[model samples]
Target chain A: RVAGQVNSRRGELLELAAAMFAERGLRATTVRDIADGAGILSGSLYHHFASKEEMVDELLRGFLDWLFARYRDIVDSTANPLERLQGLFMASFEAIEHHHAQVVIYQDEAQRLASQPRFSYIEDRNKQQRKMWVDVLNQGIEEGYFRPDLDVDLVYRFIRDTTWVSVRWYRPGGPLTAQQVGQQYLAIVLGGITKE
Target chain B: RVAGQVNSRRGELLELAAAMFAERGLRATTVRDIADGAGILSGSLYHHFASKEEMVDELLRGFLDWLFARYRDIVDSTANPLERLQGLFMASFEAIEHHHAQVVIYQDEAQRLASQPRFSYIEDRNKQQRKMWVDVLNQGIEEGYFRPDLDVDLVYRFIRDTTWVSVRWYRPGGPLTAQQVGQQYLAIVLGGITKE
Candidate 1:
């Protein structure tokens, strides 16, 4: 019962930490900043997470797990490679809309954190995301849904870079909704801008 | 003689400071950091530039002058709207490849610096770049090369964001040459990813 309460509080802490990290950057953000934002003392924050790095780890790993799990499900269930690709794109847009802060913090600090042995999952998460994307491209090629001569690695990075980097300018309340942006991006990216 | 020597050393200091500012974010870097990296004393760095803020201002203003001059030349020479648009795109990639540190410093620090009245050129540069892109785009629409139904503002932002933000991942001496990346990006941006 005590552990359950701790876990719930831990989840709340992660959310708060993510926002702080996104706005000010991970290096600039302090544990005290998170604690103060949470309307709690630094001592209380320490009670939940040892350090700011621990909070960052928890935040990043949670986001990747949540996102990649959805991607994994789509890959397993969707038979059509094209459909799967659409699913993947939609998933990315949803991540931008909903978990935008986590996405931003991860992009900003992933490489720096990955260098430390203690935060090794940061690197692993990137590799895991890349593999999933590459697999989708290969699947599409095998089914002849995608261009056979296309470079999957380059394409994967293109998709990854473009989709995720939207957080820089994308706001939740915009004239065009996330769904609209996602669909348009898919049309431009997957179907290409040419009148076919 | 004293002022000339000061100016020469000041130029060198700005060059080193800009590179460091690009590699390590402007906020994360210090005047002392630049001095140490340049193998000089902090006092000596101050002698060259009054402060870190002045150094950034000098570096960014100089970069903007050179970049806007190129933009003006291209726009003046290119008669065809599509050719002008392509030229602008190519110019950005050229700048990114050659003045990568300047491009990066602009991208990373533009927003933060804009809040300061002294650093208002950052915003001016953005507005100027936007206007140049819009002029070419408006010409394209008038010539019927671009879709009438297109959102000009969205397309401008899309082009600006994707083209410049690539600097975040583009390594100076990476396996892929800047020319190769530029060609690929141009293909996707101009004709797009479809085989017509």
Candidate 2:
């Protein structure tokens, strides 16, 4: 029971830490700030989290684990190129819907941290992402499922940017759900908005 | 020549400060930081600018002035709704190409500043921006240039976010120029990637 309660207590601390990390940034957020947030002493906060970044790394991994797993799940399930693309594309908004706090931290610190060697794991995963996306576009283009005139790399970047950027304003209880936005975005990219 | 030198020097200082602001952040950057970058004492930075924010405001207006002017130019020149939309859409990339440091500052500080009344101008301009884009979408849908099935509000947010977010990685002297990226992006939204 004691061990189980500690695990539960760790989760509660991580939840508040995630919100703080997303809002304040990793560099700006101190352990004391996080502990203060949990209404615990700074020394006591360490009972669950071994270190400040130990908590952050857990959040980071939790995000990536789910994120990459979603990609893998889609690729394994879908055979049609267009359907596959939709799954992969929609997966991003799904991540946004569920882990937006982590997602925001990803975009924010990605700007600041990816250039460093210590944070190179972020770039490694990102490179893997581009390969997955770029390959999907390559297959679609070759299969004649996408525009023949399209520059695959640029389209890849466009789709990537469009899918990821909406997190800036897509609120949880907003008028549009994340999936609704994702499907609309997918349709826009599927059927050109220009009249036939 | 003396007045000219001061103006030129002021230009140089503001230029460095702009990069610093974009690279770090406005709140994190100090007048002393800007002065050090300019190879002058913190006290010497005041010789031309009245205050730190004065320089920031100038950079801010310079970006907005050019940005809004581009939109106005397109609206006034092109009566065609489609052409007007292209101009407004492509204009963001142009802003990134020319004033990227300022553009980055806008996105970064914008996230931080837009909630306060002091920075309400950013939101004011953004609201005006939405009106313009929404009106363009409305006309395009009415006139049959855009897909009638579209949601103008979501589409506006889509285009706005898509256009703005590329500044994260669209560097100068890259394989693709900003305009090239803009046109391809425009083409995707207009035509889509799906094979017809």
Assign candidate 2 its CAPRI class.
medium
DockQ of each: 0.30, 0.57
User: Whole-model lDDT for model 2 versus the true structure?
Assistant: 0.80
Candidate 2 off by > 4 Å: A1-7, A114-118, A192-196, B1-9, B115-118, B192-196
Candidate 1 stretches greater than 4 Å from native = A1-9, A141-143, A191-196, B1-10, B27-48, B193-196
Q: Ten-residue segment with the worst summed lDDT in candidate 2 chain A? A: A1-10
> What C-alpha lDDT values do all the predictions have?
0.76, 0.80
B1-196 per-residue lDDT for model 2 (tens digits): 1111235767778888889989888888999888888889887898878877777777776677668877888899997888888889899988888788889988877756677665667888888899999999998888888878788898998888888889988989788889998988888777742223
How far does residue B176 in candidate 1 sit from its true spot (Å)?
Answer: 2.5
Q: How well is candidate 2 docked (DockQ)?
A: 0.57
Q: What is the TM-score of chain A in candidate 1?
A: 0.90
Instruction: After the best TM-score superposition of candidate 1, give how far the Cα of residue A10 lies from its true spot, in angstroms.
Output: 3.7
Which candidate gets the maximum TM-score versus the true structure?
2
